[PDB]
Design a protein around this ligand. Structure first.
Ligand SMILES: Nc1ccc(NC(=O)c2cnn(-c3ccccc3)c2O)cn1
Ligand SMILES: [Ca+2]
Ligand SMILES: [Cl-]
Ligand SMILES: [Cl-]
Ligand SMILES: [Cl-]
Lengths: 58, 249
C-alpha cells in the first residue's frame, strides 16, 4: 500500500517504508488497533472528537 | 460569519475567543491544553500584551454558564516572514499561562501531520469555519458562536473564478455569490476538516475582499505549511517578553 492513495488505508497518519511497506500511526491520545489502520482513543478527551456527539451516539 | 447557523453549544469545543481589555479581538483554535493557533494580523495593533486573554468553552457572550475558562496569554509567536498590515504568513502560535482543563466543552482540534494534511485533508471538499464575527458585511457581531460549511478551491480555480494574490501559504474557500463567508471578528478562528470520524486543523480565517463580497472567496492560512514550524515551537521553552518572532521556515 501507499500513503498517497486513499491515505494508505490508514484512519490517521501514514508513513511509507523501503519496499511494499506502510506503517499507520495515530495522534497522541489514540492507539493503533491490531488491524494496523484504525485508531481508538486512550484518553477521555482525545483531539478532534466532540464529546456531546460521541455520547449521543454511544 | 455570514450565512451560517448557531454552532450548538459544545459542538465547536476547540473554538477560542481572544479578548484585549475585555473587547472581542479575534478567534483562535485550541490544539492542546496550553497552545492556541490564531492569525498574526490579530496582533498588529496591540500595545499592552498583558491585556490579552483567551477564553475556551465560550458560547453565548451575553451570559456566564460556568463552562468558560479564561487564561492569560504568555507568548504570542509569529513567523519572521509575516509583515504587519499584509496577508502572507498569517499565523500566530499562542502559549497560555496555565493549561485549560479539558471537558465536554473544551477539547483541542487535532493538528495533523503535514503529509496527511497535504495528501488527504486538502482533498476533503467541505470544512467548517466558526466565530463570533460580523453576521453581515458592515453589520453587528454575533452573540452566539456561529459556524459555516465552506468548500475549498484549488488556487488556480480560485483565481479563475474570482472577479487576488493567493500564495502557497493560503487557500480559498467559500462562495462567490455574496451569501456565505467568514467576516471581520472571525479572523484567527478555525477552518476544521473532518476525516474518518476525527476533525483536524487545516486553515485559519485570514482575509477576504470585504465579507461575502460577490465575485470573491474567503482566504485562509494554509496550516499544512506550518506544521513543523509549530511542532518545533511547542517543544521549546518560553522566553521573557510576550511577543516572539521566530524564524520561518
Ligand atoms: N473573509 C474574511 C475574514 C476575516 C476578515 N477580517 C477583517 O476584515 C478585518 C479587518 N480588520 N481586522 C483586524 C485588524 C487588526 C486586529 C484584528 C482584526 C480584521 O480581522 C475579512 N474577511
Ligand atoms: Ca457564556
Ligand atoms: Cl492564566
Ligand atoms: Cl529551546
Ligand atoms: Cl512583554
Amino acid at each position: 500500500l501507499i500513503c498517497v492513495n486513499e491515505n494508505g488505508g490508514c484512519e490517521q497518519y501514514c508513513s511509507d517504508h523501503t519496499g511494499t511497506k506502510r506503517s499507520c500511526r495515530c495522534h497522541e491520545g489514540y492507539s493503533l488497533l491490531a488491524d494496523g489502520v484504525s485508531c481508538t482513543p486512550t484518553v477521555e478527551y482525545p483531539c478532534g472528537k466532540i464529546p456531546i456527539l460521541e455520547k449521543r451516539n454511544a | 460569519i455570514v450565512g451560517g447557523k448557531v454552532c450548538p453549544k459544545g459542538e465547536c469545543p476547540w473554538q477560542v475567543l481572544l479578548l484585549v481589555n475585555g473587547a472581542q479581538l479575534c478567534g483562535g483554535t485550541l490544539i492542546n491544553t496550553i497552545w492556541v493557533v490564531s492569525a498574526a494580523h490579530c496582533f498588529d495593533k496591540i500595545k499592552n500584551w498583558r491585556n490579552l486573554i483567551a477564553v475556551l468553552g465560550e458560547h453565548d457572550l451575553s451570559e456566564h454558564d460556568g463552562d468558560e475558562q479564561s487564561r492569560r496569554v504568555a507568548q504570542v509567536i509569529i513567523p519572521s516572514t509575516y509583515v504587519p498590515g499584509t496577508t502572507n504568513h498569517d499565523i500566530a502560535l499562542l502559549r497560555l499561562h496555565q493549561p485549560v482543563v479539558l471537558t465536554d466543552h473544551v477539547v483541542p482540534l487535532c493538528l495533523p501531520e503535514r503529509t496527511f494534511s497535504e495528501r488527504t485533508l486538502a482533498f476533503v471538499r467541505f470544512s467548517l469555519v466558526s466565530g463570533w464575527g460580523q453576521l453581515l458585511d458592515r453589520g453587528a457581531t454575533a452573540l452566539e458562536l456561529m459556524v459555516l460549511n465552506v468548500p475549498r478551491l484549488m488556487t488556480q480555480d480560485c483565481l479563475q473564478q474570482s472577479r487576488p494574490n493567493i500564495t502557497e501559504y493560503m487557500f480559498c474557500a467559500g462562495y462567490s455569490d455574496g451569501s456565505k463567508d467568514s467576516c471581520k471578528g472571525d479572523s484567527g478562528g478555525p477552518h476544521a476538516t473532518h476525516y474518518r470520524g476525527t476533525w483536524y486543523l487545516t486553515g485559519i480565517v485570514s482575509w477576504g475582499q470585504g465579507c461575502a463580497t460577490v465575485g470573491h472567496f474567503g482566504v485562509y492560512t494554509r496550516v499544512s505549511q506550518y506544521i513543523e514550524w509549530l511542532q518545533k515551537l511547542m517543544r521549546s521553552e518560553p522566553r521573557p517578553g510576550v511577543l516572539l518572532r521566530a524564524p520561518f521556515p
